[PDB]
Design a protein around this motif. Sequence first.
Motif, PDB file in Angstrom:
ATOM      1  N   UNK A 173      -2.828  -4.986 -11.635  1.00  5.37           N
ATOM      2  CA  UNK A 173      -1.726  -5.724 -12.242  1.00  5.37           C
ATOM      3  C   UNK A 173      -0.635  -4.795 -12.761  1.00  5.37           C
ATOM      4  N   UNK A 174      -1.000  -3.586 -13.197  1.00  4.27           N
ATOM      5  CA  UNK A 174       0.020  -2.624 -13.599  1.00  4.27           C
ATOM      6  C   UNK A 174       0.866  -2.205 -12.407  1.00  4.27           C
ATOM      7  N   UNK A 175       0.218  -1.954 -11.268  1.00  2.72           N
ATOM      8  CA  UNK A 175       0.947  -1.631 -10.048  1.00  2.72           C
ATOM      9  C   UNK A 175       1.866  -2.783  -9.666  1.00  2.72           C
ATOM     10  N   UNK A 176       1.363  -4.016  -9.758  1.00  2.00           N
ATOM     11  CA  UNK A 176       2.173  -5.172  -9.386  1.00  2.00           C
ATOM     12  C   UNK A 176       3.386  -5.322 -10.299  1.00  2.00           C
TER      13      UNK A 176
ATOM     14  N   UNK B 299       0.816  -1.210   0.000  1.00  2.00           N
ATOM     15  CA  UNK B 299       0.000   0.000   0.000  1.00  2.00           C
ATOM     16  C   UNK B 299       0.856   1.268   0.000  1.00  2.00           C
ATOM     17  N   UNK B 300       1.937   1.348   0.792  1.00  2.00           N
ATOM     18  CA  UNK B 300       2.853   2.490   0.628  1.00  2.00           C
ATOM     19  C   UNK B 300       3.355   2.632  -0.797  1.00  2.00           C
TER      20      UNK B 300
ATOM     21  N   UNK C  69       2.814   5.837  -3.295  1.00  2.00           N
ATOM     22  CA  UNK C  69       3.949   6.527  -3.904  1.00  2.00           C
ATOM     23  C   UNK C  69       3.792   6.593  -5.418  1.00  2.00           C
ATOM     24  N   UNK C  70       3.408   5.471  -6.030  1.00  2.00           N
ATOM     25  CA  UNK C  70       3.239   5.429  -7.481  1.00  2.00           C
ATOM     26  C   UNK C  70       2.125   6.372  -7.910  1.00  2.00           C
ATOM     27  N   UNK C  71       1.003   6.361  -7.186  1.00  2.00           N
ATOM     28  CA  UNK C  71      -0.080   7.284  -7.505  1.00  2.00           C
ATOM     29  C   UNK C  71       0.389   8.730  -7.433  1.00  2.00           C
ATOM     30  N   UNK C  72       1.145   9.087  -6.394  1.00  2.00           N
ATOM     31  CA  UNK C  72       1.650  10.457  -6.273  1.00  2.00           C
ATOM     32  C   UNK C  72       2.521  10.824  -7.472  1.00  2.00           C
TER      33      UNK C  72
END
Lengths: 83, 78, 54, 92, 97
Positions: D45-48, D23-24, D28-31
Amino acid sequence: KVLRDNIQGITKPAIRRLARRGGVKRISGLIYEETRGVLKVFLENVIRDAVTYTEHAKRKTVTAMDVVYALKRQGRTLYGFGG
Amino acid sequence: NIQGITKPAIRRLARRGGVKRISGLIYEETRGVLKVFLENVIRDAVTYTEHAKRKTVTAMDVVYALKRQGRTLYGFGG
Amino acid sequence: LAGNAARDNKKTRIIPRHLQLAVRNDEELNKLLGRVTIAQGGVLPNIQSVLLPK
Amino acid sequence: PGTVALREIRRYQKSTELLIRKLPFQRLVREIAQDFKTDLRFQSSAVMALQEASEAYLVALFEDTNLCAIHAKRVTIMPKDIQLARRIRGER
Amino acid sequence: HRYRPGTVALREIRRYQKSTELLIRKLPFQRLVREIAQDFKTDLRFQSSAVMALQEASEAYLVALFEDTNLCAIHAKRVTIMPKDIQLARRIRGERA
DNA sequence: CGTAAGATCACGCGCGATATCAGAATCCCGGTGCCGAGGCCGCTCAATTGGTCGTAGACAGCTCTAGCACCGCTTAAACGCACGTACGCGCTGTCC
DNA sequence: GCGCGTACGTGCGTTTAAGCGGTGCTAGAGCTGTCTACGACCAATTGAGCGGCCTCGGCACCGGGATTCTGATATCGCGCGTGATCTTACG
């Protein structure tokens, strides 16, 4: 909701585990911030490329294919998510 | 043959690289590294030439080989 | 940038060395040509501190 | 001192499960994406995939860092080691 | 008189970094190239431009490698490059295993 | 008065920066030649338009499923302190 | 190699937001039907870049003169050590 300072979400134990998988035994104190900086640069580049590909596709959602294409662009090909 | 790459020539290359002090075993290690690099590049260049059915390796073959190896060169018909 | 360099080196005709200087001295061009070696280009002048006399 | 370091090295070199918490990393990626363009959504799946690539990159970087540290007759990795490794890698 | 050890080295660094002329004399390098090529195919010919391209690429690669090697040596508090420096540099590059 | 301890001046010895000589570097300038750059002329070979065809793309409408959000629960994960112990830093001897 | 200063490990204690599940709302992606703009090609036309051949020159080369830069030495300066003179204390 606004997002701020998430880079500190990469906690010290996590970076330590990463170095452990990297074969590192003893870790200096200043390493952690340098590692956060390096990770931030890497993510900025990869997500820049991915968001470019997403914009071309005229989509408001980033897809795993976008990430895989971005990684292949950076000479860091990845298996396991398509492509 | 390989020894024709003289120690002082390696010294000049290092100087242009910014090295001040050089070790004795360097020269031989550099000879080995250069041998490997030439081996790979010339292998690819020949491979191309063979596919071109020519007995004369061309500069274009060398350029294509260097491109394969991610060492693009300019000034020979890019 | 190459013409600028040739002016700095006091030449009228651009030679490779000017192209090399203009590319490597410029950050973004150097990045773009990150995997390109320019024939008769040479290197930038750069001497490490500790190698300098005291 | 140092025994549990080796124990952890063996433990985390035996396994493959991800080391950075989920979740952190997502936040971070969203920011970071937000600062490139607003109103973006992500397939999980893109986040993973992003996390997989990040972890692989960081583990390889740490390997090179350790190699650099040993080269300096030292055993503790320090920022200048990372800087040397990235310079030699041709990164900026 | 005598120049103190290490000064003419710096002078040569300045001299060579300002020039772009190749530093390996042509004929030995050409004979090395021909020898290496022979082991892949017999009775081969080379365009002089091809030999020059090879020489340029190799010399540039060696200069870059020496830069990295000098950085490695400096990292170890040293001023003399040694085989371990080249090995480490290539290892991190990903050329050598 | 006479001897012993202390402060200051004079004189001598030791470490560091900066005036001078001297051989090797480096820059500038008079005068000449050249092979590469520049321009003009021919010549092919390249670029453009009258007009047609299927092809791809744009658009609109119906269908909905994982994307997003919150609540409650549980707990693995994260942070601060005692300390001492191996690691990092610095000085020094040797000879490669 | 020796000697000294110390960063942070283990353990303990304390505290907290990260995963499960449970519900609820839903955005734009995905899949059918309409409609339309345009590039390859054929004929025919026209014209521009490449090459051959002329012409010209910025810089290499030579040779000479002038200005700079390390290595060595020595004086000025400052700091430490020793003897002579003046001062104070004790006998």
